[PDB]
Amino acid sequence: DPEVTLLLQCPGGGLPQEQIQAELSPAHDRRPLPGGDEAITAIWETRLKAQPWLFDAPKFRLHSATLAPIGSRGPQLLLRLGLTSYRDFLGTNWSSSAAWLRQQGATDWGDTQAYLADPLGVGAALATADDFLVFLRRSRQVAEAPGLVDVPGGHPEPQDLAGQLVVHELFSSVLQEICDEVNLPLLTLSQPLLLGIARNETSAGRASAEFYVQCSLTSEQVRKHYLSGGPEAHESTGIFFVETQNVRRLPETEMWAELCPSAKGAIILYNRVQGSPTGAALGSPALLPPL
Ligand SMILES: N#CCC(=O)NCc1ccncc1
Ligand SMILES: N#CCC(=O)NCc1ccncc1
């Protein structure tokens, strides 16, 4: 699967909010383009003069993420975060020249991402009380990944001593994206666990944090909540469900070629971190069928 690379696989079946530190520093920002950020400004002007109702928004930037030694006490993960914008994204990762920017970053900084916006995404492997994962069908009219299968998520807009508020906003934002798009009540959702971080190689290597969230509703009840908002309540064009039993082999199905890079990251991390049992009982042949 060349379109997705794993940056991080969390231990312990996934990390809760209380085990994660962030460092939000301008040292973690994108570097100015070699010939100047006027190139980004020019692309933005062209876009606004065609679509004047567009607006900029701030985004978090992922610089790097360092896991503690496994088995340790205290904080288990440090996220090194900067700030970027939707404008900077459109001028870098989304640009036809994004591969040239990666090569220049390797040359100048020994960092393929140094000249890229790399806005941080969030997504969920969202499980039902009757053991299905939730999938969404993207509109064929949107700019990114038209017509492909996705999971719930997005690219959060901002607002350890400012760090803990940043970790709180990231965990809050994946629940808010589930409430906004799937139309579920907040009180039906578990506190999220971070499964890991995945890079989207079709979008010049931008990274997304992928979470596991449990819902106390059945698949039939989730479908009812999604549909009862009507066409204007969601950006997706449909909802569907796959048994957790069958997610195990999803990369061998015809569905795999329809999943956008976001969703593929979330399913690989769910299979490695929540699936793949380690103990004698769940690892027995009747419960973990060979092949
Ligand atoms: N920031 C960020 C990510 C993002 O906006 N995703 C896809 C996209 C949306 C609108 N136009 C082009 C591409
Ligand atoms: N490519 C693509 C679509 C996209 O970015 N969907 C939102 C998203 C879903 C899961 N993880 C992170 C972000």
UniProtKB/Swiss-Prot annotation:
Binding residues for Mg(2+): 177, 181
For the ligand (substrate), the binding residues are 55, 86, 138, 143, 150, 155, 157, 262
Which metal ions or organic cofactors does this protein require, according to UniProt?
Mg(2+)
- Domain of life here? Eukaryota
Q: Identify the stretch(es) annotated as Disordered.
A: 147-159
Record-level GO cellular component terms: nucleoplasm
- The keyword Metal-binding is annotated on this UniProt entry: yes
Catalyzes what? UDP-sugar + H2O = UMP + alpha-D-aldose 1-phosphate
**What UniProt keywords are attached to this protein's entry?**
Hydrolase, Magnesium, Metal-binding
Outcome of swapping residue 177 to A: Abolishes enzyme activity with UDP-galactose
Q: Where is this motif: Nudix box?
A: 163-184
Q: Does the keyword Cytoplasm apply?
A: no
Q: Could you say which protein family the record assigns here? A: Belongs to the Nudix hydrolase family.
Q: What is the documented function of this protein? A: Hydrolyzes UDP-glucose to glucose 1-phosphate and UMP and UDP-galactose to galactose 1-phosphate and UMP. Preferred substrate is UDP-glucose.
Query: What PANTHER family does this protein map onto?
Result: URIDINE DIPHOSPHATE GLUCOSE PYROPHOSPHATASE, URIDINE DIPHOSPHATE GLUCOSE PYROPHOSPHATASE NUDT22
Q: What is this protein called?
A: Uridine diphosphate glucose pyrophosphatase NUDT22
The organism named in the record is Homo sapiens
Question: What is this organism's lineage?
Answer: Eukaryota, Metazoa, Chordata, Craniata, Vertebrata
What is the gene called?
Answer: NUDT22
